[PDB]
Subunit: 121 residues, 4 copies
């Protein structure tokens, strides 16, 4: 059952009309991420890798350190959640990526972020 | 126009019966905060100050670093949210406070938290 | 004595020949900062402001968050030290700045960094 | 040419008599570390792994996050230094390890710490 090092991620995308203009191919989505330490030991999120694909198969990548300027050391059971934006020239698209993390024992590990869909309601 | 350093804060309280004994004035509210970067430049949340006021005008202050152990550096457009609790000896009260923040330029600035109220859904 | 929130900073600059060329007006110095919590409560380093001045009075400013991409919450007594570089077209110059910090009680405060000079080994 | 992600590590051991007892075979060594960004891009130290060997080839390992509670993000040319201790049953031994790091681009890489020795000055 329980694992020593496990982090669970849930992402809920949503279109934002309030600041989008499909008339000129301006689509703005907002995805809210929920990282949850589901393992038996503390673990820290280090870096993030993102792959956003267009409605026309146009790939774009983002790489950086930490999530919203931090690399939280999550105790087993706690959560960390933020919401960031994703612009697209098409009304639909996908997003998939990776969070690079590390257990308290220092050994790094990867927690994949399942590819999800993005489209107007 | 648009400000270079600005963060808007919204809170949603909600009484929690399952862990409060009104029989002994032990009221427990849960609150969620949404800090969103409205300005045009990256900004970060450093420390908080809460002034929770009692139904009988009794006050209790809280002062510490970060929010639920985090000091998010929110890019413009990004938002960070957390849920925390608040005890009260009365079924209604108001929480108000400040967040001490700093822009990507390292300069500190304050973002006030508007006085909102906590009340039993009853 | 012994204040509630206090951080003392010591900086030791040093010209670096191995990567400097005075014939091209390329002077590279390395300063080593040493932050020490000299107060009764923990405190955290948040941001830094640097004013570097030229041998010809030419100013340059650097502002950013943290020190070495970190904002250490120093326990009373512990220290944090790193060394960063400082390029200059002149063989001498000064550096003066500010660290913006915050006590564990969330109250912010500033620990000023006294103006020191940079010059080649001799003067 | 010059590497994009490269960190150089140097250590200076130092026996500490006033904090050890040879008689009881309790040898205490202090050691300072200098990590310098020799690469062309910013890099950060995340976690450490140490393998300290005994004069009698007795191993002892250590694994943790950060270096003395810090995970410096060194701009190229910058360096971070700290001092820790190392207990020993013998008056001589070696310490060798690894630092797990990440480039500003988030990709993790490893910077090894070459085996160096600890020994009483006498």
């Amino acid at each position: 059952p329980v694992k020593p090092y496990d982090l669970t991620v849930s992402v809920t995308p949503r279109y934002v009309p309030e600041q989008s203009d499909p008339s000129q191919q301006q689509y703005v989505f907002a995805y809210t991420v929920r990282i949850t330490n589901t393992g038996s030991h503390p673990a820290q999120v280090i870096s993030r890798h993102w792959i956003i694909t267009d409605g026309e198969e146009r790939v774009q990548e983002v790489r950086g350190l930490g999530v919203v300027g931090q690399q939280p050391l999550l105790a087993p059971g706690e959560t960390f959640e933020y919401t960031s934006g994703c612009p697209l020239p098409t009304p639909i698209g996908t997003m998939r990526g990776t969070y690079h993390c590390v257990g308290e024992n220092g050994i790094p590990f990867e927690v994949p972020i399942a590819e999800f869909l993005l489209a107007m309601p």
